[PDB]
Amino acid sequence: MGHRTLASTPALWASIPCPRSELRLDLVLPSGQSFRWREQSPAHWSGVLADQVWTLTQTEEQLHCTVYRSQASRPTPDELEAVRKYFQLDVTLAQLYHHWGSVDSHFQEVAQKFQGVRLLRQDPIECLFSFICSSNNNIARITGMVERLCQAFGPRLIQLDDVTYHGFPSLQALAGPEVEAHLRKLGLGYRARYVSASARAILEEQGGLAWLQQLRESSYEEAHKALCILPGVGTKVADCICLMALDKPQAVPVDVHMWHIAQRDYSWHPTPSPQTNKELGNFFRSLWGPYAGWAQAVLFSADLR
Numbered sequence: 001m002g003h004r005t006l007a008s009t010p011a012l013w014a015s016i017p018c019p020r021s022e023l024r025l026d027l028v029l030p031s032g033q034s035f036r037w038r039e040q041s042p043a044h045w046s047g048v049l050a051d052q053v054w055t056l057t058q059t060e061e062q063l064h065c066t067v068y069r070s071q072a073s074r075p076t077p078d079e080l081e082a083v084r085k086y087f088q089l090d091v092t093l094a095q096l097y098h099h100w101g102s103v104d105s106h107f108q109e110v111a112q113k114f115q116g117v118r119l120l121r122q123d124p125i126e127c128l129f130s131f132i133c134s135s136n137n138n139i140a141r142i143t144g145m146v147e148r149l150c151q152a153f154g155p156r157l158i159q160l161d162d163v164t165y166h167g168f169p170s171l172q173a174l175a176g177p178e179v180e181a182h183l184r185k186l187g188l189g190y191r192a193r194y195v196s197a198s199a200r201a202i203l204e205e206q207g208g209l210a211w212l213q214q215l216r217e218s219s220y221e222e223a224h225k226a227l228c229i230l231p232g233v234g235t236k237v238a239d240c241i242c243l244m245a246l247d248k249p250q251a252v253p254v255d256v257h258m259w260h261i262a263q264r265d266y267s268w269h270p271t272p273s274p275q276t277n278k279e280l281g282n283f284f285r286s287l288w289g290p291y292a293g294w295a296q297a298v299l300f301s302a303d304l305r
């Protein structure tokens with residue numbers, strides 16, 4: 001079995017009305033939100049979404065989706081709802097791009113060269129453990145560690161060419177007393193202890209998946225504080241999970257990367273440290289407004305290119 005392309009199997013693809021202004025897969029899927037997508041063929045993005053493998057590709061006006069499960073067929077309208085939810089396609093980006101463009105002139109400039117930078121709505125467990133794997137790491141090496149984590153502890157879904165896709169591990173799988181030693185063997189280093197000890201904390205102390213739904217329904221301030229009780233989850237990782245899985249669109253994760261960007265392109269300086277990081281966060285919330293994390297995604301994606 002091989003990765004599908006739109007050209008070679010058109011009947012297996014369902015289309016979503018989606019202009020390049022609302023979504024660019026190439027500025028979203030590889031741009032440090034999810035680490036589960038690879039361009040396995042030009043303009044064709046393959047990855048695990050809701051425990052199934054998908055390939056996504058787009059033309060000027062449409063997003064095209066295929067799902068690998070039986071006999072091959074088009075995604076059902078119900079299956080496509082997972083895709084709509086993941087890309088938050090209810091949110092009209094054009095309205096957000098204008099509002100940011102008005103209140104910030106550098107952004108306005110970047111925005112018309114980098115259309116369709118959306119924020120994924122990610123599964124809380126996948127997002128939490130992926131961003132625990134993100135510390136002191138580039139996108140390349142994070143992607144590798146997450147792949148090896150899922151290979152070890154997640155269910156095998158399918159093989160396409162020489163890529164074996166796994167579901168994201170459950171809390172139960174990551175909480176086991178052998179997990180930390182095995183994840184060290186896979187090169188996660190110090191992040192191994194964080195993954196295993198956080199899985200255990202969530203299961204035994206916080207009450208499982210119910211806690212991450214509770215944090216979804218809570219304020220940014222509550223949810224951020226709540227996440228920072230987990231081994232390996234400080235301001236940076238808490239802000240990532242807040243923005244990308246817990247619907248806190250005002251969350252702005254700040255590292256040395258976001259800092260070289262604000263230094264150069266915004267003539268900012270601390271009046272890199274916890275105190276200086278929080279100031280920077282506050283600035284971007286003051287400037288861009290209640291969806292500041294989304295505006296940050298445009299600049300970060302832009303900067304990676």
Ligand SMILES: c1ccc2c(NC3CCCCC3)nc(C3CC3)nc2c1
Nearest residue numbers: 032033134253255257258296297300
């Ligand atoms: C490794 C992996 C991912 C990221 C990352 N992802 C951003 C997070 C906020 C918006 C969208 C994606 N951001 C940053 C900096 C804050 C800019 N560093 C990373 C280092």
